[PDB]
Amino acid sequence: MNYSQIERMARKGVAFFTDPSRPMNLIKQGEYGYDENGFEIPPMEQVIPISGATRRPNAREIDGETIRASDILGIFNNDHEINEGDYIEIDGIRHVVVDARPVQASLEPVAYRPVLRRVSV
Amino acid sequence: MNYSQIERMARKGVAFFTDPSRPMNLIKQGEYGYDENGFEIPPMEQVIPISGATRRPNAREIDGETIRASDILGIFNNDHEINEGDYIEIDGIRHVVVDARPVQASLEPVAYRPVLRRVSV
Amino acid sequence: MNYSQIERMARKGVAFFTDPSRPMNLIKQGEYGYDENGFEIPPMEQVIPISGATRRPNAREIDGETIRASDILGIFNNDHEINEGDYIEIDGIRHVVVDARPVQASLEPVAYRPVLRRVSV
Amino acid sequence: MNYSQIERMARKGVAFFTDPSRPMNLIKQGEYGYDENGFEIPPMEQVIPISGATRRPNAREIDGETIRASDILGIFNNDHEINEGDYIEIDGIRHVVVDARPVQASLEPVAYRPVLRRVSV
Amino acid sequence: MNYSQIERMARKGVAFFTDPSRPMNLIKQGEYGYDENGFEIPPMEQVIPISGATRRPNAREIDGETIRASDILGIFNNDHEINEGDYIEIDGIRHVVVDARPVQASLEPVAYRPVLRRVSV
Amino acid sequence: MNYSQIERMARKGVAFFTDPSRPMNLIKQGEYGYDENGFEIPPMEQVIPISGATRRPNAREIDGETIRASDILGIFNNDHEINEGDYIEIDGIRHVVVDARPVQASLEPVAYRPVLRRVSV
Amino acid sequence: MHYELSAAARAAFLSKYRDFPHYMENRNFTPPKDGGMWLRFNYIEGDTLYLSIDRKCKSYIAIVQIGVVFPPGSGVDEARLKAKEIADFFKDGKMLNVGYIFEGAIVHQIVKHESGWMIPVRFTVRVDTKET
Amino acid sequence: MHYELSAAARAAFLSKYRDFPHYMENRNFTPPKDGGMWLRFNYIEGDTLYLSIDRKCKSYIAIVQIGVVFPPGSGVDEARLKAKEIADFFKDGKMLNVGYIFEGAIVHQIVKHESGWMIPVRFTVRVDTKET
Amino acid sequence: MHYELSAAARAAFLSKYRDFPHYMENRNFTPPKDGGMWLRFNYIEGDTLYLSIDRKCKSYIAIVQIGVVFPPGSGVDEARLKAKEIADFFKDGKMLNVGYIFEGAIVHQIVKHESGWMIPVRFTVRVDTKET
Amino acid sequence: MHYELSAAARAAFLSKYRDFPHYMENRNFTPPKDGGMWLRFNYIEGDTLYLSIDRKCKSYIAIVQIGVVFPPGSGVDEARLKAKEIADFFKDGKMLNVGYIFEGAIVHQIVKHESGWMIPVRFTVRVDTKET
Amino acid sequence: MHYELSAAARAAFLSKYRDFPHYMENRNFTPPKDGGMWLRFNYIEGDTLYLSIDRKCKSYIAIVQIGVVFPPGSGVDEARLKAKEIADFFKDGKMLNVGYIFEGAIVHQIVKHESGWMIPVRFTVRVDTKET
Amino acid sequence: MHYELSAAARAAFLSKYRDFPHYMENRNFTPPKDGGMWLRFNYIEGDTLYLSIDRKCKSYIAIVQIGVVFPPGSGVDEARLKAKEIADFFKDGKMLNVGYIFEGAIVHQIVKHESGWMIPVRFTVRVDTKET
C-alpha cells in the first residue's frame, strides 16, 4: 500500500542516473479542427522543459538505403503527464512518444517509461 | 489440501496491492432472444461494484493510423464470478473480458486473472 | 530402481492437490464396424468414475465469433489406463484427450498428464 | 581422459533408469540389391534383444484426421551400436530411429540418445 | 552520477582486453556534393590509428556461393567519435560500422560497442 | 593481457577431452587457375595429421529421402591455421569447415571452434 | 434495402428450428455441455448492381451460410443426413417475405479440425427494387 | 488539381457530420470512452488519365471510404441502419463544388475483429480539367 | 442425393477390402503394431450442377480418395503393385447401385515424409437425378 | 547511353532544388534536426529495346521517383501542395540536355507508417539512340 | 501399365551403371566416405490420358530424373562431363523393353547449396496400351 | 553438347578479364583485402529445342550472368561505367568459337544490400547442331 513511498523512491531513482547538462524539451500539440472549407493549421506549441534518463539505443534500418537514424527509450517523472502522441526534444533531435507505459498499480502513476521513435523516417 | 486457506491468502494478497480510489465496475448482460420478425434489443445492464488490481499495460498499433488505444490484464477476487463475455469499467473506460483464467485446482476457483481488451477498436 | 516407490509418491502427490467434490468421469468408445451397405452405429458408452487435478486454463479464440470455450491440462493416477482417443467428463463439460503424455520411464506408467480440449469447437 | 571411467559411469546410470520387464528389440536390415530386370525383396531381419531408458513423450497431429500417433526419445548403452535408420520395437509398437545422437567426445561412443518416430504415420 | 569514474573504468577495461600488435585504423569520408552536371568524387580519406577489442566472430553465407566472409563486433574508447557510416581497418581487412551503439547514460558517451560488417559481400 | 597463459590453458584443455586414437586429417587445396581454353585441374592435396575434440552431433534431413548424414562442431589447437573452406578427414569421412570461429581476442588466435558439415549431401 | 432481407431469412430459419441449439450474429453463446450437434448462422453481403443508364432500378444479393458441427469419433452419417434435410428444406425458388431464393441447396466439402468437425451449407437470396 | 478534390470531400463530409465522433488523416484521435459507434475517414488517390494527343486535357479520380464501428455482443442492426443512412445521403449524380460523384452508396462484407466490428461504405469522385 | 453416394462408395470399397486394415472418416483408428501398410478413406464434396431452366433435373459429383501408406526403408514396388490392383478394380464405367464412376483409376505422385510414405489414388462418381 | 540520362536527370533536379534538403543515392545522409520535410531521389532502370532487324537503333527507358516525407501528426495539405508543385514543374514534353521526359506528373497513393508519412511522385525519361 | 515402366527404367539405368555409386527409392543409403560424386534416382508420376470415346485405348507418361551430386570447391566441369554422357546414352527414340523414350536428354539449371551441389537430368518415358 | 558452350564462354570472359579479380563456379574465393570491386561469373542453363520431326537438328540455349559488386557509400557511377564497358564488349551478334550470342548487353535494376551493392548484367548464347 502507501504509494507515496513508491513515489519518493521512484523520484530519487530517476534523479540518480541523470545528467543536468542535456537539454530536454516537451512539445504538446492539440485542439485542431478544420475550416468550413476543409483546411487549416493548429497554431500551438506548448513547450516545457523536461529532465530524465535514456537507455538501450538502437539503429534504424529500412532497405539498405543509408539513412542512419536511431531510436531510444526513456524514464521520466510524474509531472507534465505524457499522452500517446507528444514530441520529445532530445539534444537537437525530435522524437515521437509511441508508447507511454506508465509504471502503474494504482491511480496517479508514479513514473513513465516511454518509447521514443525518431520523427520523419 | 484445505482450500479455505488458499481462499484467505488469495483474498489478503488481492487486498494488499489495491487502491480504494479507482472507480471500477462490472457489467453482466444476458437473456437475449429474437422476435418473430428477427430483431430486438436486450434491455438489461446489471452493473455491480468491484475492486482489484491491474498490471502490464500495453499500447495498441493496428496499421499506423494513430488510433492510440491501450489494453490491460487484471487480478480479482472470488466474488461475483466472471464469465467469458462480461464488461469491466475502469475509470471511465470500458473493456471486454476475453479470457477469464480462473486460478484453480478445485471447484469454486480462488481467484481470477482475466485479460481485458478495450472496447471498439 | 524400485518404481513402486515412485508409484506411491505420485499417488500421494495426486491425492494432495485434488478436490473430492468435482464430478469427473471417463468415457471409452470402441468396437465399431460397418454394415454391408455402409452405415451403422456402435451402441456402447463405457463410463467410469475417476478423480484428478487440472491446471493451466486457456480460452479458445477462432476468428472472433464469440463462441467462448476453454481448454485445460490434467494430472491423473495409474489406474484406468488412458488411451489417445477417450472422453473426459468434467463438471458437466466433456473434453477429448488430445494428448496422453504419460510420465514414464518404465512399463505401467506411474501417472498421466493429459491435454484436454473441449468437445465440438 | 580415461574414457573407460565415463563408460562405466554411463553404464551404471543407464542401468539405474531402466526396467527389465519392457520387451525392447532392435531390427537391422541391410544388403539389398536389385535384379537384372529391376525388382526383388531383401530377405533379412536381424532382430536382437536390447534394453534402455526413454523420456519426453510427444503426440502427433497431422491434419486433424484422428490418427493417434506418438514419438519418444531414448537413452541406451554402447552395445550393438545404433545406426541412422534402424528399427526399435517397443511393447509391440515399432519406431524408426530418425537420429542417433551419440553422446560423444571420442570414438566408440559411450552411449546413445536416439530420437524415435512412430512407424507409418 | 560521477561519470568520470565510469569513464576511467571503461578505458582501463578496454586496455586490459586488447592486443597492442593488431594494426587497426579508422577511416572517415565526408563532405560530398555533385557537380553542376551531376557527377564528381569526394577526394579525402581521413585515416587515424585506433586500438580496441573484438569478440564473437560470425561467418557469412549467402546462397552456397563459397565466398568465405566474416563479421565481428567491437569495443572502443571515447575519442574520435564513431559515426554510423565509418570504415574500420582490422588487420589488413576493411569493415563498415553498421551500428555504433554508444554505451550511454548521458552526454559525451563513455565507450562504443560497434557492429562491423565485412566490406563487399 | 598475457595471452600465452590462455594459450597454455587452451592447449591442456583440448588435450584433456580428446582421444589419441581417432584418425583425423587436414586437407588444404589451393592455387588453381584455368587454361587458355577454359578448363583444367588443380594438382595438389596437402594432407596433414591433426588431433582435436568434437561435440553436438546433428543429423541431416532434407525432404525425407533417407539420406542419413550428420554434422558436428570441433575444438582444435592453434597450429596449422584453419580457413573457411578447408577439408577435415574424420575417420574416413570428409567434412567442409563452413565456419572457422577462432576463439579470439588478439592476433595469433589461441584455438578454433570450427563448424563442420558432411561433404556431398 | 439489405436489412429487411436478413431479418426475414433469420425469421424463417428461426421459425423452422426454434428448439434446436444454434448460434446467431454477435451474441455470446456457449456450446452444449453434452457435445451434441448445434447450428451456426452466418450472413454475407453481396454487390449491388446498377441496371439502367439513369441509375434508378437496382438489385440486392445476399449469401446465407449455415453450419453443422459434430464431435470427433462419432462418424459422418448423422451429420450428412442432417445436412440433407437442411438442403431439402431450403429448396430453389421459395419466396421469402421480402425476397426470394436465387439459388439454393448447396453442400460444400467438410472442414476438419482435431477438436470437432463442421459441414457448411450455403445458398443465395435476392431482392429487386426500383427507386423513383 | 488533386488538392481541391480532397478539400471538397472533407468539406462535404464535415458539413454533414460535424458533431458525430470521427477520425481524419494524420491527427491524433482517441475513441469515445463509452465505446459507442464512430466514423473513420480515408482518402485514396486514383490514377490520372490523359485523354488527348496534345497532352492538355486531364482527369483525376479519387476513392472515399467511410467505416462504421460497433462493439461486440450488441447485434448488427443499428450498424446496418446507420450504414444505409450514409449510403442514402451519398447518392449518385450529386455535384460537389469542385467535382462530382461517379457512383455512390455501395456496402460490402462485414469485417469482424475480437475487440469490435466494422462495416465499410465506399464511393468515388471525379474531376476533369483542360490546361491552357 | 448425396448421402447415398457416400453409402454406395463405402459399400463397394468395404465389400472389396473387408479384411485389409483400413481407416474410415472420423473414427479413432490406430495403425497396426507391426507397421504394415493400411488403407485410408476420404470423401470430397464437389459442386452440384443445374442443368435445366426450370431447375428440376440436377447432378451430383463426388471425389473419392484412397491412400496407401508404408514405412520408410521398405521399398516401393509392392505399394505400386497394390495401387495398380486398386486401379484395375476401379475401372471407368463401373455401375454403382446409386450412381456411376465418371472417370477412375488415376495414380498421383508420391508424397514423402520422414515418418512414412503415402501414395494417393483418386477417382470420381456421379449421379444424375430428376425432381417432380 | 545510360550514364548521361542519369546525369541529366540529376542535374535538372538539383538545379531546381539545390537548397531544399534532399537525399541522393548511395551517400550517407542524415535527416533534418527539426523533423521537417525533405526530398528523396531514386533511379530505376527500365528495359532496353532493340528496334530494327540489324540491331543498330536502340532505346533506353528510365524511371525517376521523388518522394516527399512529412512527420506524423502534422496534416497532409502542405505535402499535397508541394507534390502538386513538383508535378507541375515536371510536365510532359520537357526537353532535357540528353533525352526527354516520355510522360510525367503522376501522383500515387500515400504509404502510411507510424514514424512518418510519404507521398511518391513518379515520371519517366527516354533516350533514342542510333549507333553508326 | 505403370509398374513395368518403372521396372524397365531401373533395369536400363542400373545395367548401364552397375558399379558407380547411386541411391534408389526408399532404401537407407549412405554417401561415399570419400565424398565423390554419386547418382540420385527419382520417379515422377505424370497423368494418364484416355484416347478414345469408348474408354479402351490409353497412354501413360512418366518422368525420370537422375541427379549428379558433387562436393563444393571442386569445380563443375566433371559433373557436366558426366551429364553430357548420361544425356548422350539416354537419347530420344531409344526403345526400352516395355515402352519408349518420349523425349530425352534434358539438363536443367544447377541447384546450389553450402554442403554439396547437384545437377539434374530429366527425361520422359511413354507406354501406350489397348484394353481388350 | 553443352560443355563446349561453357568452355567457350569461360575462354572469352577469362581472356578479356584475366587480371581483374573474379570468381569462378564452385571455387573457394576470397574477396580482395581492400574490398575493391570483383567479378562474379555465373552460368544459367535454359531449355533445349527439338526443331524438326526426325529429331535430328537441335538447339541449345544458355544464359550467362556477370555480376559486379562494390562497397556501400562509394558511389555508383563508376560501377555503371564498368558495366557499360562489359556490355559494349559483349555486343550483339558476336561469333563465338562454338556458338554465338543470341542477344547481349542488357542491364537490369540494381539490387541493394546493407553490406555492398551489386549490378547484374545478363546475356544469352545459342548453339544450333545437326546430328548425323
TrEMBL record, chains A, B, C, D, E, F:
<protein>
    <submittedName>
        <fullName>Connector protein</fullName>
    </submittedName>
</protein>
UniProtKB/TrEMBL annotation, chains G, H, I, J, K, L:
<protein>
    <submittedName>
        <fullName>Terminator protein</fullName>
    </submittedName>
</protein>
